[PDB]
């Protein structure tokens, strides 16, 4: 259901719209959203479980 | 009398008008310095004002008559 509801054909568009919703505007580049996502939950800097 | 406000009201009929007439009559006597008509009995001006009201001796009408007449005689004394 949700998959059909999910229009991002590709991972790339997913990156774009992630970046977009998070950074509303139109500056898109790749490394921005890439490092963004990676820093959310996959960098030691901005995230830790205890 | 002192603690109770009964027959002073039964004379007039309304608490509001009663304290208005009281607080006029006893400003004529607080600051002015005119004379009582009921005896004194060592109380402040409030009780004696209420006493003068009870026995039908001070009223809005009666104050009106007295001050009217006196001020008119003073107007005559001017000329």
């Amino acid at each position: 259901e949700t998959l059909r509801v999910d229009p991002t054909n590709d991972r790339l568009s997913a990156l774009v719209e992630i970046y977009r919703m998070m950074r509303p505007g139109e500056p898109p580049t790749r490394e921005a959203a890439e490092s963004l996502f990676e820093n959310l939950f996959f960098s030691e800097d901005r995230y830790d479980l205890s | 009398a002192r603690v109770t406000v009964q027959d002073a009201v039964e004379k007039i009929g309304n608490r509001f008008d009663l304290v208005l007439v009281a607080a006029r009559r006893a400003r004529q006597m607080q600051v002015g310095g005119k004379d009582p008509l009921v005896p004194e009995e060592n109380d402040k001006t409030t009780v004696i004002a209420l006493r003068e009201i009870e026995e039908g001796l001070i009223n809005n009408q009666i104050l009106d008559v007295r001050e009217r007449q006196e001020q008119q005689e003073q107007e005559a004394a001017e000329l």
Binding site: - | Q6, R15, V19, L20, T46
Partner: protein, 1337 residues
């Protein structure tokens, strides 16, 4: 000083030029060291004013040699000061930025007008997109946006002949363009072309804004800012501290902010920049402007290093925090004090303990005038010296002042007018205030850590108001009810109870007296019992004659205490009232009789002595209570073990798998509660009457010796429940879930808890305590809104000359009397001449004071209904007659004019609500029966079954005034009829409480017609027996081939006709819905009254009740009389083909037929007839019904909510607010003014009292009547200030200003905060004098 009225308006720019004194030019204010107001900064004295007297800054001009000589060097004034709180400077702007309140708030007021979307305008004004100022060519259009890149296309195409920019410049121009009149007549015109609803209201809206700007003369371009004020420093100050440490306001930042930006604006504008930076800069500017008006409105707020927002200008007006609720309506006060408190048992009424220093320092200038008068202190320095010297004379002098000088007593929270009082002073050598304890009952107070505050009546007016009005002798009852509020609280009751007491036991039995004096001598000699029935003589008195006592005397065998007690009694009474043990209710009614009969002062002084003697002979009476006064029965362990071996029975039953948990659960709790009850009964029989004391006999038993029962019997404290908890089990316990615990308690505090028992005891204790910690918030909130509504209302007139109002009938229903119509009437006044069951025995000429002689005279009569001139039926514009109100209770006579009323009901209603949140029909006795509004039938039993749901049962007495009353369902079964007599205790009615009967009143054959298996229905023949019929399914389950086809088995005869409804040609057959399953097949016949089928199955409440809150689930009703069929087939909702008899059919509305219907697809209704089932809404009632029905419904509802809790208030109060909800009526017709618009029903009645008078047969319009939610009803007000004080203020203020409106200070709230006198009561006379001055010029 004196002024007539107020006004709001739109300040022109030149208006501000007029207001201002100099323009401001820099962000600086002072030096670092010479903490000095700088020129042209913030605090420049040159424009705002000087510090000292006649001192220019450099001291050039001085000492009036140079009087009006502005020191040219510093440009500084010379003359007098105190204008740094007055003078406002100003600033001229570079360019226009906008005001925001006329932009951001709901309906936008600015683009609202322009018929344009907001976001479009944002795109303009965040400087994102250009837009047509004006299409020079009509190729393009005004109100048309051009992106700054498409604008290029529009541009390079033409360049010349268009006007399109991006900013207030683009927009003031637009405002500066647009002409109002043509637009207005155009909307007026083309409304009549197409005045559909949303369209019509929108056109009306814009026409209103138009003609408002027309006739106001206020202007559209004034929205926008080109000059800006600046405040005096003293509202925005900066000061140092003793540490040299400085302290400022928020706003001095923000002013400062803008300066530099405007400087960096203009500074840049010297320098020819790209527009982009200018846009950015302007953004910064208007952002700062928003921040001034509201830090946190449009977006993310602004802070310093506080990390906290800077306080808005608006925040100064706001919440409580602004002027209204903090600083203006509540105030700090001079000449007041406070202290811890205590009791004076000895005291009398007017007296009050007073630690003397309090009055000492509080009565100082009396004393200083007095010492100058004596000249011991010739003047006041020496007076204070001698004060420090502590001369005895002072105290005499102090006493010599204090005599007859009344004083004010103050506790909080103040829930009603009686929570403060006015006494006479009494001095004492302590620091704890002694008082007359009973009035704790008024204050709800207790000597457990309470404390209180005090105020002074300096002026004679206050002095005398105190002595006359909230003198306690003038205040003894509630206005809520005729209740003595000085119930003897806790001890006096008990000592007296113990005294008036009839043992047999003590001694001295069967002797005789002369009178109670020797009774004293005799007991006091030590001969006798103060509790012993023995003979004496009395001499009691009666005023049977013309208010004239009538003496007599005879003997009585009575207890000694009572004889003694007669000595107190003032000689107008029998002995019968004092002839008993006198529970405290007896005391209540006893004092009641005293003022009933004699009046006040006997009852007063009587009561004081009763207090005194209660203390005396209770402190004599001897008393304590201990471990052995607490007593346990023995018949507890055995009931315990018995039910213990039965809980184990059902335990093993569930082990085998028989019963459920819920069955098990309910039955276990039933047996445990029964065991509790049995334990209570055992201890009651074992403690109440157990004692065996002989007295001239073998054994004798009377009032107990346990020491516990008569604590409850006196009413002092406690009841059977608490005592049970000490002795027996203390009921059950709950975790805060709301569930109920299974294993109850066994021990008590005499025996001692388990670990677990107390562990569990924890829970609901915490819960209900939390609730106790929060119901006051809602309480204060609500009561605050209540006063917020009804501030306007005061009596004006003796008699409004009005036509009739309400009817009164008792509320007895379902049980015995719940409100005697006697109790309803008393002190009201008739609507109408009123005769007796002896016909034509009129006794009112339409209005008398309905005092208790009249009420007794009635209660004789079998009359059971009467009308009364209603507050609503009163018609006094802007107030009332006193007749439609009648009596002030705690006065105890007719209400005099001038006293305000709405506040009174508010205190009446708000105060108590703090305490407040926490089959068959069987005839009882004999009596007449009264059923009506009836269609029914001799059923197939021969007895009676309803065929008009309207009807319900009553047991009327043999006379004609009711006993009992109970609902009766449509077609339920009876064993009786109306107009008969029946024995008591007799199941007269019965029915299946599951069935809603489909009974056929007709007699006619059955044949399967209109209905076929699996088209409209299913066929489900009962597997067990075999008989059935065509089985109707629900809305969904049936097949769609006949789901649009109404299934109806049809009543026929041997021929096939329609058995028409008996008496009307209407056919009789049933368009059967779901669950209307018939059991007998084709060819079968039914009886009259024969089911073809059956139909098998607090605080926030009241908050919603008064709020005008409204449900979602109406038991929807008949809009109009006449027959109905059903409608469209459920595109979300079915519709409803209505058909009046003579009216018009087409009305029909979306129905969720998912929920059950009342009337069927071929069945007729009268208007005012429910159609679905559920709750319903008030607006439906007004919209259809009269009023009396309505108001009567709601008063019954909520009074029950009260009385549920055992709560007592007169209905009159609740009438009052009704008329304040009803201050607006929507118009029907037109010709006077705009068509439909809600407006003062009062002023409607004015204009028609001018215009539809022979001014015109008619020009104006008829009108509906409306209703409002209470807070918004408060908002909808002629004045705005009462509206502006508290809630949704900003919006009200804007809407007030747009029309340049004004006010006249008629509500009291209006005249308070200005310092004027009240428009009522005391100042009624003054303010009506002022009124006729306004009448006399």
């Amino acid at each position: 000083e004196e002024f007539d009225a107020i006004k709001i308006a739109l300040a022109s720019p030149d208006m501000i030029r007029s207001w201002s004194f100099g323009e401001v030019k820099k962000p600086e204010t002072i030096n670092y060291r010479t903490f000095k107001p700088e020129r042209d900064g913030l605090f420049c004295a040159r424009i705002f004013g000087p510090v000292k007297d006649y001192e220019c800054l450099c001291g050039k001009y001085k000492r009036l040699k140079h009087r009006g000589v502005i020191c040219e060097k510093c440009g500084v004034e010379v003359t007098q000061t105190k204008v740094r709180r007055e003078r406002m400077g100003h600033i001229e702007l570079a360019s226009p930025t906008a005001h925001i309140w006329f932009l951001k708030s709901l309906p936008s007021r600015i683009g609202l007008l322009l018929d344009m979307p907001l976001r479009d305008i944002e795109r303009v004004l965040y400087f994102e997109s250009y837009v047509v100022i004006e299409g020079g060519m009509t190729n393009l259009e005004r109100q048309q946006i051009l992106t700054e890149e498409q604008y290029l296309d529009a541009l390079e195409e033409f360049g010349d002949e268009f006007d399109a920019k991006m900013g207030a410049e683009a927009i003031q121009a637009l405002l500066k363009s647009m002409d109002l009149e043509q637009e207005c007549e155009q909307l007026r015109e083309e409304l009549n072309e197409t005045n559909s609803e949303t369209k019509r209201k929108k056109l009306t809206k814009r026409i209103k804004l138009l003609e408002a700007f027309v006739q106001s003369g206020n202007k559209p371009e004034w929205m926008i800012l080109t000059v800006l004020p600046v405040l005096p420093p003293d509202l925005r100050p900066l000061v140092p501290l003793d540490g040299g440490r400085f302290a400022t306001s928020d706003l001095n930042d923000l002013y400062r902010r803008v300066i530099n930006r405007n400087n960096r604006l203009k500074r840049l504008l010297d320098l020819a920049a790209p527009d982009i930076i200018v846009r950015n800069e302007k953004r910064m500017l208007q952002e700062a402007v928003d921040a001034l008006l509201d830090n946190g409105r449009r977006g993310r707020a602004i802070t310093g290093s506080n990390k906290r927002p800077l306080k808005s200008l608006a925040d100064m007006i706001k919440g409580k925090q602004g002027r209204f609720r903090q600083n203006l309506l509540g105030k700090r006060v001079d000449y007041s004090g406070r202290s811890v408190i205590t009791v004076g048992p000895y005291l009398r009424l007017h007296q009050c303990g007073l630690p003397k220093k309090m009055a000492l320092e509080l009565f100082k200038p009396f004393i200083y005038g007095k010492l100058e008068l004596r000249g011991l202190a010739t003047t006041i320095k020496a007076a204070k010296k001698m004060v420090e010297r502590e001369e005895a004379v002072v105290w005499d002098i102090l006493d010599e002042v204090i005599r007859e000088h009344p004083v004010l007593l103050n506790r909080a929270p103040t829930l009603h007018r009686l929570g403060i009082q006015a006494f006479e002073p009494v001095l004492i050598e302590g620091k704890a205030i002694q008082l007359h304890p009973l009035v704790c009952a008024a204050y709800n107070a207790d000597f457990d850590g309470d404390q209180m505050a005090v105020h002074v009546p300096l002026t004679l007016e206050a002095q005398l108001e105190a002595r006359a009005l909230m003198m306690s002798t003038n205040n003894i009852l509630s206005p809520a009810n005729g209740e003595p509020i000085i119930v003897p609280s806790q001890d006096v009751v008990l000592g007296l109870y113990y005294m008036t007491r009839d043992c047999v036991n003590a001694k001295g039995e069967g002797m005789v007296l002369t009178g109670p004096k020797e009774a004293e001598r005799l007991y006091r000699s030590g001969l006798a019992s103060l509790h012993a029935r023995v003979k004496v003589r009395i001499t009691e008195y009666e005023k049977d004659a013309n208010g004239e006592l009538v003496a007599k005397t005879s003997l009585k065998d009575t207890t000694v205490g009572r004889a003694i007690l007669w000595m107190i009694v003032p000689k107008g009474l029998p002995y019968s009232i004092v002839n008993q043990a006198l529970g405290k209710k007896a005391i209540s009614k006893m004092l009641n009789t005293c003022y009933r009969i004699l009046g006040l002062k006997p009852t007063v002084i009587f009561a004081d002595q009763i207090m005194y003697t209660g203390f005396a002979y209770a402190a004599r009476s001897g008393a304590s209570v201990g471990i052995d006064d607490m007593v346990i029965p023995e018949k507890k362990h055995e009931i315990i073990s018995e039910a213990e071996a039965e809980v184990a029975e059902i335990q093993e039953q569930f082990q085998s798998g028989l019963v459920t948990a819920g069955e098990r659960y309910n039955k276990v709790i039933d047996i445990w509660a029964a065991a509790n009850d049995r334990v209570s009964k055992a201890m009651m029989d074992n403690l109440q009457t157990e004692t065996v004391i002989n007295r001239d006999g073998q054994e004798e038993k009377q009032v107990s010796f346990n020491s516990i029962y008569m604590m409850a019997d006196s009413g002092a404290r406690g009841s059977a429940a608490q005592i049970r908890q000490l002795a027996g089990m203390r009921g059950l316990m709950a975790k805060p879930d709301g569930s109920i615990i299974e294993t109850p308690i066994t021990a008590n505090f005499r025996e001692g808890l388990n670990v677990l028992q107390y562990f569990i005891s924890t829970h609901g204790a915490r819960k209900g305590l939390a609730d106790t910690a929060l119901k006051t918030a809602n309480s204060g909130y609500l009561t605050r809104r209540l006063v917020d509504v009804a501030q306007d209302l005061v009596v004006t007139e003796d008699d409004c000359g009005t036509h009739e109002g309400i009817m009164m009938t008792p509320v007895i229903e379902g049980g015995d009397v719940k409100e005697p119509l006697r109790d309803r009437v008393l002190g009201r006044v008739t609507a109408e001449d009123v005769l007796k069951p002896g016909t034509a025995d009129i006794l009112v000429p339409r209005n008398t004071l309905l005092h208790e002689q009249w009420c007794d005279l009635l209660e004789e009569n079998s009359v059971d209904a009467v009308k009364v001139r209603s507050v609503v039926s009163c018609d006094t514009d802007f107030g009332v007659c006193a007749h439609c109100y009648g009596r002030d209770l705690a006065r105890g006579h007719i209400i005099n004019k001038g006293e305000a009323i709405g506040v009174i009901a508010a205190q009446s209603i708000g105060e108590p609500g703090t305490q407040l949140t926490m089959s068959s029909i069987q005839v009882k006795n004999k009596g007449s029966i009264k059923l009506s509004n009836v269609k029914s039938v001799v059923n197939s039993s021969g007895k009676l079954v309803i065929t008009s749901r309207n009807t319900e049962l009553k047991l009327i007495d043999e006379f004609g005034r009711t006993k009992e009353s109970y609902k009766v369902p449509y077609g339920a079964v009876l064993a009786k009829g109306d107009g008969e007599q029946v024995a008591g205790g007799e199941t007269v009615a019965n029915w299946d409480p599951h069935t809603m009967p489909v009974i056929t009143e007709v007699s006619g054959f059955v044949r399967f017609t209109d209905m076929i298996d699996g088209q409209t229905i299913t066929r489900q023949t009962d597997e067990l027996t075999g008989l059935s019929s065509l089985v109707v399914l629900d809305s969904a389950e049936r097949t769609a081939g006949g789901k649009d086809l109404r299934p109806a088995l049809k009543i026929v005869d041997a021929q096939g006709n329609d058995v028409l409804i008996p008496g009307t040609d209407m056919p009789a057959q049933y368009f059967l819905p779901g669950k209307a399953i018939v059991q007998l097949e084709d060819g079968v016949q039914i009886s009259s009254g024969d089911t073809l089928a059956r139909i098998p199955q607090g605080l926030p409440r009241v908050a919603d009740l008064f709020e005008a809150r409204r449900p979602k689930e109406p038991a929807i009703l008949a809009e109009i009389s006449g027959i109905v069929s059903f409608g469209k087939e459920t595109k979300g909702k079915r519709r409803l083909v209505i058909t009046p008899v003579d009216g018009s059919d087409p009305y029909e509305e979306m129905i969720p037929k998912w929920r059950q219907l009342n009337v069927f697809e071929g069945e007729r209704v009268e208007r005012g007839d429910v159609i679905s089932d559920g709750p319903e809404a008030p607006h439906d009632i007004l919209r259809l019904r009269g009023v009396h029905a309505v108001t009567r419904y709601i008063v019954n509802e909520v009074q029950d909510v009260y009385r549920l809790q055992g709560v007592k208030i007169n209905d009159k109060h609740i009438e009052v607010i009704v008329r304040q909800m009803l201050r607006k009526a929507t118009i029907v017709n037109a010709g006077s003014s705009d068509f439909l618009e809600g407006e003062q029903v009062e002023y409607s009645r004015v204009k028609i009292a001018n215009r539809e008078l022979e001014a015109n047969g008619k020009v104006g319009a008829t009108y509906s009547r409306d209703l409002l939610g209470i807070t918004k009803a408060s908002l909808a007000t002629e004045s705005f200030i009462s509206a502006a004080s508290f809630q949704e203020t900003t919006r009200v203020l804007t809407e007030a200003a747009v029309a340049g409106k004004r006010d006249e200070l008629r509500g009291l709230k209006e005249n308070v905060i200005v310092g004027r006198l009240i428009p009522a009561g005391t100042g009624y006379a003054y303010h009506q004098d002022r009124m006729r001055r306004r009448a006399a010029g």
